[PDB]
Amino acid sequence: SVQPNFQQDKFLGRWFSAGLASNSSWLREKAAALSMAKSVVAPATDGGLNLTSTFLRKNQCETRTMLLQPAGSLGSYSYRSPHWGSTYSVSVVETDYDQYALLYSQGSKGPGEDFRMATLYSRTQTPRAELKEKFTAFCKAQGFTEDTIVFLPQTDKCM
């Protein structure tokens, strides 16, 4: 399930990781104990995307980069994780490009095959009420119970 007629160039740039829902209790715990700064979506070679996440961990600014390769329909990507020895599909399910994107990720190969995550990307660091509701409803249609949805703490300290 992808955004119809997905335009990758319009998806680029600065986003904020504003909420998530996952079936990993470990991941929800870690994320909520962090403060999120901007994410940057940039082009990689062969039509890929470089996703760079910045966050505050013990008042230290840190960054992680993920290489996403196009895979399947326009708007869908695959991510090979060295650390988890697994591959994950990541799809932009719904975006208006200018305000929000709803992402859905799940394992496709390896031990992480069962992993599932919904992500709210927002162009603003604090998403409006209606955007928060849109994300919660999306999480529920993806089969996440309400207590597995987390709106992530944000910081302006790594900008």
Side-chain angles (χ1 to χ4, degrees):
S1 190
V2 290
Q3 169 61 44
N5 199 20
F6 179 73
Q7 312 286 317
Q8 184 168 291
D9 280 350
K10 282 196 267 252
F11 183 70
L12 304 166
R14 183 185 301 191
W15 291 97
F16 292 93
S17 183
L20 72 78
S22 174
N23 63 347
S24 178
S25 64
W26 178 86
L27 183 64
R28 298 192 313 262
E29 287 175 353
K30 284 298 171 305
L34 289 170
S35 286
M36 302 305 294
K38 70 175 179 172
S39 301
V40 176
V41 174
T45 51
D46 198 37
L49 291 177
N50 287 324
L51 198 145
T52 304
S53 299
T54 309
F55 57 97
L56 191 70
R57 173 175 129 95
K58 303 234 306 189
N59 266 261
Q60 286 310 294
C61 276
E62 260 175 271
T63 189
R64 300 292 158 251
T65 57
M66 297 180 238
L67 176 57
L68 303 181
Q69 272 106 351
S73 37
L74 248 183
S76 289
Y77 298 84
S78 57
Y79 167 54
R80 293 180 182 94
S81 174
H83 185 256
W84 303 96
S86 297
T87 306
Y88 302 86
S89 92
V90 184
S91 302
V92 181
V93 178
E94 177 185 321
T95 183
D96 66 352
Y97 305 104
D98 299 329
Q99 298 271 82
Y100 77 95
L102 307 181
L103 306 200
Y104 183 74
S105 299
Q106 55 186 351
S108 59
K109 190 184 178 182
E113 236 166 45
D114 295 284
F115 180 78
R116 296 171 56 235
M117 182 168 58
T119 303
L120 166 61
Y121 265 180
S122 181
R123 289 297 192 175
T124 54
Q125 186 151 50
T126 299
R128 294 175 304 141
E130 156 61 352
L131 182 47
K132 288 177 75 189
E133 292 180 56
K134 184 194 295 294
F135 181 59
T136 291
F138 173 80
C139 294
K140 287 173 313 184
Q142 299 296 346
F144 297 103
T145 64
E146 195 154 314
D147 62 11
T148 73
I149 305 171
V150 180
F151 290 96
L152 304 168
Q154 301 294 314
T155 183
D156 34 34
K157 292 176 158 231
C158 308
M159 215 48 66

